[PDB]
Amino acid sequence: MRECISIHVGQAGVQIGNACWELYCLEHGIQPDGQMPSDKTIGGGDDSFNTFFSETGAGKHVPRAVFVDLEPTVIDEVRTGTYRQLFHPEQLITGKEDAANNYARGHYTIGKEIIDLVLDRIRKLADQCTGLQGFLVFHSFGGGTGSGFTSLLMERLSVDYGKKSKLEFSIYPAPQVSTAVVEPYNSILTTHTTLEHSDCAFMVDNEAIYDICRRNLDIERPTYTNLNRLISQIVSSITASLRFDGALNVDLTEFQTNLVPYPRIHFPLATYAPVISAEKAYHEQLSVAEITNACFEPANQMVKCDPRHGKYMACCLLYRGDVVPKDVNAAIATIKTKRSIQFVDWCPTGFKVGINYQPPTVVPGGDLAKVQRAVCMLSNTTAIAEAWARLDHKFDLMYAKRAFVHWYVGEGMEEGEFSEAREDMAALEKDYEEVGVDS
Amino acid sequence: MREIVHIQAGQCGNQIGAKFWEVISDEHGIDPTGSYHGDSDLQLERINVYYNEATGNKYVPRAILVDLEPGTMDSVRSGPFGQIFRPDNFVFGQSGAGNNWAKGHYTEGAELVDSVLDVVRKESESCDCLQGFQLTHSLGGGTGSGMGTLLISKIREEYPDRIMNTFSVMPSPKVSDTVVEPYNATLSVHQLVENTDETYCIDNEALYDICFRTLKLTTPTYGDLNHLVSATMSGVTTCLRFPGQLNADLRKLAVNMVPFPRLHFFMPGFAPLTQYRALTVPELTQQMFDSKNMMAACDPRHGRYLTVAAIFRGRMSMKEVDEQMLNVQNKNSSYFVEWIPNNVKTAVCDIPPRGLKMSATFIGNSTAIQELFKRISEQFTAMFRRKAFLHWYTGEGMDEMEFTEAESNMNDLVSEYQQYQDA
Amino acid sequence: MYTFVVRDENSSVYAEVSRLLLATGQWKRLRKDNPRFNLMLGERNRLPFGRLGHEPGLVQLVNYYRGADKLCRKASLVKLIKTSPELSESCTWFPESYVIYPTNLTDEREVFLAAYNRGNVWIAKSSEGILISSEASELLDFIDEQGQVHVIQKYLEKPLLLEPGHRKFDIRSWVLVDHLYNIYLYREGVLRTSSEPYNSANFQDKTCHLTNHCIQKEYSKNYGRYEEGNEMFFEEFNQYLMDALNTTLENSILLQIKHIIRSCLMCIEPAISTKHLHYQSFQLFGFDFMVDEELKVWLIEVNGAPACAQKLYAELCQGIVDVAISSVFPLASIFIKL
Amino acid sequence: MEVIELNKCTSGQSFEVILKPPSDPSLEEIQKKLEAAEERRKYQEAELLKHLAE
Ligand SMILES: Nc1nc2c(ncn2[C@@H]2O[C@H](COP(=O)(O)OP(=O)(O)OP(=O)(O)O)[C@@H](O)[C@H]2O)c(=O)[nH]1
Ligand SMILES: Nc1ncnc2c1ncn2[C@@H]1O[C@H](COP(=O)(O)OP(=O)(O)CP(=O)(O)O)[C@@H](O)[C@H]1O
Ligand SMILES: Nc1nc2c(ncn2[C@@H]2O[C@H](COP(=O)(O)OP(=O)(O)O)[C@@H](O)[C@H]2O)c(=O)[nH]1
């Protein structure tokens, strides 16, 4: 058994983290007070769920997690929330005033003052681990803390834990739910600084989640609560292999091995199906073929883009529920003859498949109906570069006029960092183009 | 708890500031005694931003009242909510400033300023985490304009890393007290360009026009004008006073609204302009963008929006709000600068203002605001070219060169707006 | 009130479309960089498809299908037909073609020589720059002094010749594919004819062999003797077929043309369809056909950014507005649906 | 289309199907960057206080 430590940074990271651990407890039969009657070994153990949960002598199952935010209001909700007994005060870190949607404020000004505190709290979790394998880091691109402090934290983690893998779950900015005009600045700055310190990053575009909630859950105006419970289901599908008995993606290093052939190109596209409204009284359960077919539809992707006009480097299928290998292969065979699936020449055209018999767990009173089977596809496709192109274009529009730049320089950041960050993104787009397109 | 410290200076400053506290005390369920008698807990969740808690669960405005003469502040203390202010926070002299920026800034104000800063320091020390300051004042008089900007400079010296915000009332010949108002306003704008992060430009010309043309008030009084201002102030501070995601604090608002340091002068708007018929969301949205609902007497169509913040209050479809806000942008995209993507942000608060089912408040950083400054500059030059009325200022030790510098800087500001209007 | 942007100033077709939109009073033209558009008249090269469909509150439409270039590039068209099982290696309406890369640089240089040894007049062309030879020796020596890729297909030695004049021709058909992937064939096509007699013994001359309007008004006189600007329309051509061959244009030719159009576009549909996509697209295509002595129709190429005949500009562009644009953005048939 | 590495347990199964074969900054350096930014903030604030002193 090898432990994983989750780190939740800023409002988005914390609120998503709260939704994930809520779901984790429901999936593992852990009560809000920490007790888990299924676990017969009291005070310890090396089961698969122990990768995410430690144990006390009283029988409390405690999340291997740290929550960090530069203002206290969001984390204070965790301290008094339903699962307040789950976490102990040392795990929840709050500052006084936030980064004001300013990367430089989060990275340099406030980051410098709190980075040592956060690392020592992480050390305390790491000291409990017999064989720590790495970290899962949750944060937004657009927030000052999410962008700025995360990139600093990721740098220091590479220093203090050189052999440890680091995975990201990153919230990509969408103006429909965005809170800052400068989020493109923050996104490019944090991607530039974090790029060499992250082994595998799962980007989630708020635009995609927003539209899935409207389209499939019939929610007229999705809130963060609606968005986070859906994101939580996808995150759960991705991390399920670490928390349950299995033979695929059983360790963090395997994510890189299976999904990331080239280091810089470490942003897999996630696609999830099915998403069905709980308010829908009459519903017909979808088959293996149908939910697998839905994995190649842009409307179900965590980032809107067109994989038909890109190339695949790797593809992983993660099933939950009533699924057998026979039906998966029959589904894939049909899809290959009816859809455009181009792999790069230096990679085998194939799928790694994982099946967990336990169907998806849904929060009671949530928006998601319980289904007999679901699937999350993780595919490393060059089509996700469309998201970088969009972001870089918005960056270019503002930076050409140096709009808002003085806020960053005022926090001690050099104007050159804008250029260096943008040049790095230009190279990243070029890398995708070289791998993906022809002539 | 991120506290704001409120300061009101001079006649205009204290009269509009008093009305502001009356309005938001009512919104937060605070009676004119400090006692809370509301029904919703949304009223108290962010009450500490503007109020301190005293003995017996009393709420006291974090407000400092300043003037160089006792008259207006005597009237405030005799007012309806007059007893709610902290007695020690009344700081006043006896001499007056005679509508003279120099008296407020250099002589009479200089004698009083340290005692104001003592009170400012006392309030700041009580704060768990001070955001910054908001000042209400006029630019056309002596105390609010001269001593008000003196105060801003001194505060910035002691609290250089805090946000400075002002509600600044711009003078107009239509509603004028003295001929030297353009002098006092030009000297003040110079100060504001350098030492504030956010300034709401409240034009008395616009206020008068709204009362007369739209509200059909035959003979508008300052009281009628202040009704519009207190309503505007309530609306633009809604995001600060209630739970929300967008512009929830002074610094996040500034980062969203101010792309260039000197261009931080906002045109505020409000709808509906105040019978029993509630306004639909399309009506709120259309009216809040209408020039007739603007408080700066500038035509938005004569310029472009760099950034816009819109706040909707009341029970309404958040979906319909989004659609209408997108509708405005998509059908008038020429008036929004292209080089700042998604530059219009919208917030919705469930608590509506008193007497209204639904309300909308508009905050725009528009290049059309240059019309306001050009108006002042012309009135300034008309007198200054003949050195008219200058002896009032040179008598207080000021030199003509200081007037030339203020004029040049405001003309520079106008030029900078024009640059980004064409960009 | 709908809005649109223009990013291809050199398009005669969509310049006229731009006119009609403005003439309705319900369309406004924005700056080319303004992201808040409903309709994009895109550029021919490197159209930013990735930036489309991400503007909240806006239904966005573009006048190009992403991926359609596979039909509209000569090297790509050959590869598409031979690779796609829907079109198969044994395609009857497409001339035997081979993709040949220059040696100075998936190549079929060897395969071409095999069939050649087995009339052997072939034609060399790329995406003026055409060599028509009956000897494969000088065909291959032509592509190594250019640089880019080329294709070698059988030069149809027995074309249908119009009389009087004994002259070669080609048929241009305009095809509009809307956002629902309905295939619309414009009822009016054009005959780009040669004004010189066809000589099967003079391939040195590149005039009576190339029916290009570029090489009929230039480097070629007479011109406009038989028909105005070497362009014959379907009314006259159909009358000619009835008088000379006792058949109709619909029966002898158009039936095959419609079949070929359908086959090509249905083949790439799953690759380019915007049915469940966050932005919608349509596109106008120019299909070029060749007819032999036995009234068999051959596909020559497909043009992704075609111009139109001067006479037919008004009707077609209006048809584009009604079918492709107004269908998505309604205001306050000249096409044959395939 | 062949299936390889089929592993089975009580909680589920995993396998691989192939359709076609193929054809850091030092700790000291971090602190230097942070201290450099701090000194720039200090210089900017020093210039402000100088300006206000004038
Ligand atoms: N999906 C999702 N997105 C969120 C959530 N909270 C914030 N965001 C997004 O994250 C961006 C704002 O960043 P935040 O995470 O709120 O900022 P922060 O990291 O707390 O940093 P500062 O507040 O600036 O110190 C915007 O794009 C929001 O749409 C959430 O709970 N769920
Ligand atoms: N296999 C073949 N047999 C007979 N003639 C042929 C041929 N291939 C090409 N041609 C002739 O060559 C001419 C030009 O061919 P091609 O289509 O390659 O040029 P082009 O692409 O410039 C025409 P456009 O671009 O205007 O549609 C055609 O008019 C046709 O008559
Ligand atoms: N809107 C409004 N404007 C005022 C009020 N009182 C004064 N003014 C304006 O403020 C300017 C006079 O400044 P005032 O505040 O009286 O001088 P001070 O006491 O020296 O600051 C003139 O432009 C007046 O039109 C008021 O109550 N409301």
Ligand SMILES: [Ca+2]
């Ligand atoms: Ca145990």
Ligand SMILES: [Mg+2]
């Ligand atoms: Mg935050």
Ligand SMILES: [Mg+2]
């Ligand atoms: Mg007065």
Ligand SMILES: [Mg+2]
């Ligand atoms: Mg061509």
